[PDB]
């Protein structure tokens, strides 16, 4: 599938979410360069104010843009499932707080890469770090370990994401990730990805938004 | 002094370190844009394989290229020391491990911003996160609290750097930083903070132990202003 990702590919992300009843929608437009492992996107909240902090939606808001080095091309599941695409289902548990439950489809629609997502956050408490909006405008992770699930013909990943809290503490986010191809065609070994995220604001944007620049690279101590 | 950083300024970094007896040198070339708070550099180890993981040297490998907002220009200590420059002394205590001790001079040689540092690390353990090289190739986002030292006509800062470890844990690096002008008039700031976001990458066309660093630093904390 590593064919349609040479050159720059336009990205559209659509998310419809519901956290504790608070229903919202986010639309992100941009473009990705898998050759350089580069993502340049801009998300806005189409419905109004975002009920959760932007960093909390980073993991949910296209791993098919990660740069796989030429000697690790056998590890690329994300590209392989294209243009048929894959389904990314996730469960994100926030320590001492609520839980995100996401289901998304990442596929090629025309010559534009699309990530369409349904999100259901429940049992979220306040003050907290999510509903109370006390997470800083940044993002830290790594390194994410991807395994193959040959029993479902997809991949499984489990990782811990630490969100920096404004007081100086740390908000834990346990990600349990499952990916399963839509079509049939394409099974990687134990490898890790290395995305690096930087968050900013559009000075000419008076709405709720997040400008995301990202650097994803595949690597492996094997 | 701030008018020296309008536009793109070339940057030369030179780091000479000694960790547990292991001597090493790092040479960095790049350019910085203080208006956008952008910072592009490339560091190489000219003495061979780096004895320490790259992330631990990022904090020591030029805060005069940070983006200060229009209303906080009067609180920009770093640019006001230019072109004569400033001295930046640091003690970095790694929790349950050794300690870096650094002293740097950041000044304008010709039309080039040069950071010449001296590093000495002691009491590091071999099977630890640093000498055992257990740290992941990244760098977390941070918020530094910059305060004014009116007794040294300079500034003070103390912060916590979290380096990611391979086993899914965190290696804490406690930084103690003090910046002093030469004397020689400098702007002493009010209580404010810097926000830092870095990205480390490699050059595939380099066969030497290196680090390609991209960095975005912005200033905030003062209410208008
Ligand atoms: C997805 C998007 C951005 C990140 O920084 C990231 N880190 C770790 C795992 C997944 C992921
Ligand atoms: C210097 C460079 C990059 C960083 O991320 C950083 N963080 C905190 C203090 C200093 C510093
Ligand atoms: Cs743009
Ligand atoms: Cs939970
Ligand atoms: Cs499951
Ligand atoms: Cs040499
Ligand atoms: Cs290293
Ligand atoms: Cs120590
Ligand atoms: Cs980062
Ligand atoms: Cs001191
Ligand atoms: Cs002096």
DSSP states of B44-107 as a string?
Answer: EETTSS-SS-THHHHTT--GGGSB--GGGGGG-HHHHTTTT-EEEEEEEEETTS-EEEEEEEEE
Q: Which residues contact A100 (CB under 8 A, 6 or more apart)?
A: A19, A56, A60, A90, A91, A92, A94, A119, A120, A121
Residue that is written with structure tokens 């109370």 in the block: A132
Considering CB atoms only, which of B138, B141, B200 is closest to A138? B141
Q: Are B222 and B192 in contact (CB under 8 A)?
A: yes
Q: Which residues contact A114 (CB under 8 A, 6 or more apart)?
A: A11, A12, A13, A14, A105, A106, A107, A108
Domain that residue B223 falls in: 1-225
Residues 193-212 in B contacting A (C-alpha not used; CB under 8 Å): 195, 197, 199-201
Cis peptide before A127 (omega within 30 of 0): yes
- Residue B183 Cα to ligand 11 middle (Å): 5
Q: Which residues contact A219 (CB under 8 A, 6 or more apart)?
A: A69, A72, A143, A191, A192, A193, A194, B137
Q: Whose CA is nearest to atom 8 of ligand 2?
A: B142
Give me the residues paired with residue B142 across strands: B196
Provide Rg for chain A, Cα atoms. 17
Closest CA to A61 of A69, A53, A70, A49: A53
- Residue A198 Cα to ligand 1 middle (Å): 11
Residues constituting chain B? 225
Q: Are B133 and B56 in contact (CB under 8 A)?
A: no
Interface contact A160-B141, CB threshold 8 A: no
- Residue B215 Cα to ligand 10 middle (Å): 27
Q: Are A86 and A185 in contact (CB under 8 A)?
A: no
Ligand lying nearest the CA atom of residue A61: 1
Which of helix, strand or coil describes residue A161?
Answer: strand
A108: tokens are 């090629």
Q: Determine the atom of ligand 2 nearest the C-alpha atom of B140.
A: 5
Q: Are B153 and B40 in contact (CB under 8 A)?
A: no
A173: tokens are 């986010």
Q: Whose CA is nearest to atom 10 of ligand 2?
A: B59
A177 CB near ligand 1 (under 6 Å): no
Q: Does A7 touch chain B (CB under 8 A)?
A: no
Q: Are A92 and A173 in contact (CB under 8 A)?
A: yes
Residues 75-104 in A contacting B (C-alpha not used; CB under 8 Å): none
- Cα–Cα dist B196/A34, whole Å: 26
Q: Are B136 and B57 in contact (CB under 8 A)?
A: no
Considering CB atoms only, which of B168, B195, B199 is closest to A196? B199
Give me the residues paired with residue A144 across strands: A193
A65 CB near ligand 1 (under 6 Å): no
Considering CB atoms only, which of B137, B162, B166 is closest to A194? B137
Total count of domains within chain A:
1
Closest CA to A157 of A179, A126, A185, A127: A179
- Cα–Cα dist B146/B159, whole Å: 10
Question: What CATH number is given to the structural domain containing A73?
Answer: 2.40.155.10
Which of helix, strand or coil describes residue A110?
Answer: coil
Q: Whose CA is nearest to atom 3 of ligand 1?
A: A59
Q: What is the resolution of this structure in A?
A: 3.0
CA triple A149-A155-A157, angle to 5 deg? 110
- Cα–Cα dist B225/B220, whole Å: 11
């Amino acid at each position: 599938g590593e064919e349609l990702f040479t050159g720059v590919v336009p990205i559209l992300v659509e998310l419809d979410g519901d956290v504790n009843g608070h229903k919202f929608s986010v639309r992100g437009e941009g473009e990705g360069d898998a050759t350089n492992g580069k993502l340049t996107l801009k998300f806005i909240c189409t419905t109004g104010k975002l009920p959760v902090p932007w960093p909390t939606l980073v993991t949910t808001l296209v791993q098919c843009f990660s740069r796989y080095p030429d000697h690790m091309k056998r590890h690329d599941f994300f590209k392989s499932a294209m243009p048929e695409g894959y389904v990314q289902e996730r469960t994100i548990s926030f320590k001492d707080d609520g839980t995100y439950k996401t289901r998304a489809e990442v596929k090629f629609e025309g010559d534009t890469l699309v990530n369409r997502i349904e999100l259901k956050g429940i049992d979220f408490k306040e003050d907290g770090n999510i509903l109370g909006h006390k997470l800083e405008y940044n993002f830290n992770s790594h390194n994410v370990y991807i395994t193959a699930d040959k029993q479902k013909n997809g991949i499984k990943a489990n990782f811990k994401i630490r969100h920096n809290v404004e007081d100086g503490s740390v908000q834990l986010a346990d990600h349990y990730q499952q990916n399963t191809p839509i079509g049939d065609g394409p099974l990687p070994d134990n490898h890790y990805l290395s995305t690096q995220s930087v968050l900013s604001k559009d000075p000419n944007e008076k709405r709720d938004h997040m400008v995301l620049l990202e650097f994803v690279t595949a690597a492996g101590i094997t």
